[PDB]
């Protein structure tokens, strides 16, 4: 007979607001000797699971009924125990995903003057998770092209125009569009009047209006786009460096490309730039764990674990299922369980868990003290 092993584990859910399925499910089971009892964790808090209830468990497995963002959004746990001892399993996300359309209300008038840089506002409707935006020249699906004189943010979604002209008169509208696992959506806003008073005969020298932030946080691997638009007259261009589009993709990044880059906003008449530094951080992942030790009585044991990743993440231990901390038969030492001595009260389930700003992962293992 034995302990808990985790056969499978709750992972992170975006539930899409609407839906046909009147259900959520957040699957975890066990394999133990004898059969394993279960229990789940909310945010931090345990949870009611009872008879006529609403939050069901279905062996392992936690089933909420209807679930709400204002409700149910959080972090669930699962909790795996017998006679030997609990697990706990990874956290998992539960996250809602919507798109509300935009008001119906008007939109604010956005007057400039011909020559002059000009932004347009999206202002876009409630929305998760993030969105790409284009513009809409009148009607649909009449796309406004990114080409230099023109550039839509997909951060804020504001259309940029850096110098303009008497072919940028019309009417104008932000389309936000959100894509998830198994559906796109498309909203689009009312349409914006772009007046154009009288010409500006003058230039000037470029000013960055749509900058990228002074620190970017990324993981190993992730896509990467810095903005930089400018206005300007002429039409100012875009240069990029390590301390030519107005968007920097890095596709896929690795620990290299960390650093203070550059943009320069340059037309003929000055240049305008602007310094952000990429940070290449990087998840917990195991490199070493704790294996199922069966042991002498009165033996000695020493169990480790060491996780990598930026930044160094802290190694944490559990028995049960409960934060272990250094206690008179046991010695606690960041990544380092050592038993001075064993009795039998040690023959149960441990893990250690390793930890930083970007996540937590689990390693476990069971103890037998033996005679």
Not at 33 to 49: D, F, I
Not at 297 to 322: D, F, Q
Request: with cysteine; proline share 7%; net charge negative.
């Amino acid at each position: 007979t034995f302990g808990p092993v985790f056969e499978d584990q709750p992972l992170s859910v975006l539930f899409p607001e609407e839906s046909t399925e009147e259900q959520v499910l957040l699957a975890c089971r066990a394999r133990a000797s004898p059969p394993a009892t279960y229990r789940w964790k909310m945010n931090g808090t345990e949870m009611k699971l009872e008879p006529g209830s609403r939050h069901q468990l279905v062996g392992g497995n936690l089933v909420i009924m209807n679930p709400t963002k204002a409700q149910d959004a959080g972090v669930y746990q699962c909790l795996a125990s017998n006679p030997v001892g609990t697990v706990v399993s990874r956290e998992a996300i539960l996250r809602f995903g919507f798109l509300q359309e935009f008001s119906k209300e008007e939109r604010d008038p956005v007057k400039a003057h011909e020559g002059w840089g000009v932004m347009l506002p999206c202002n876009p409707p409630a929305h998760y998770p993030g969105l790409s935006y284009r513009w809409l020249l009148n009607e649909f699906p009449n796309f406004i092209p990114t080409d230099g004189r023109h550039f839509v943010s997909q951060t804020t979604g504001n259309l940029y125009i850096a110098r303009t002209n008497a072919s940028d008169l019309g009417n104008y509208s932000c389309l936000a569009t959100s894509h998830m696992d198994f559906s796109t959506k498309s909203v689009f806003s009312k349409f914006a009047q772009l007046n154009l008073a009288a010409e500006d005969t003058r230039l000037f020298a470029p000013s960055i209006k749509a900058r990228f932030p002074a620190e970017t946080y990324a993981l190993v691997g992730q896509q990467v786009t810095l903005e930089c638009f400018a206005f300007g007259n002429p039409v100012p261009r875009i240069k990029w460096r390590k301390v030519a589009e107005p968007t920097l993709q890095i596709p896929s990044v690795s620990f290299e490309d960390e650093g203070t880059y550059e943009c320069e906003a340059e037309n003929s008449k000055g240049r305008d730039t602007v310094q952000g530094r990429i940070i290449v951080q990087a998840q917990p992942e195991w490199l070493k764990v704790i294996s199922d030790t069966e042991a002498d009585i009165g033996s000695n044991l020493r169990w480790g674990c060491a996780a990598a990743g930026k930044p160094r993440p802290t190694v944490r231990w559990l028995r049960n299922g409960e934060p272990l901390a250094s206690q008179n038969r046991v010695e606690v030492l960041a990544g380092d369980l050592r038993f001075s001595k064993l009795s039998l009260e040690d023959s149960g389930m441990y893990q250690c868990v390793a930890e930083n700003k970007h996540g937590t992962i689990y390693a476990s293992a069971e103890l037998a003290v033996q005679a």
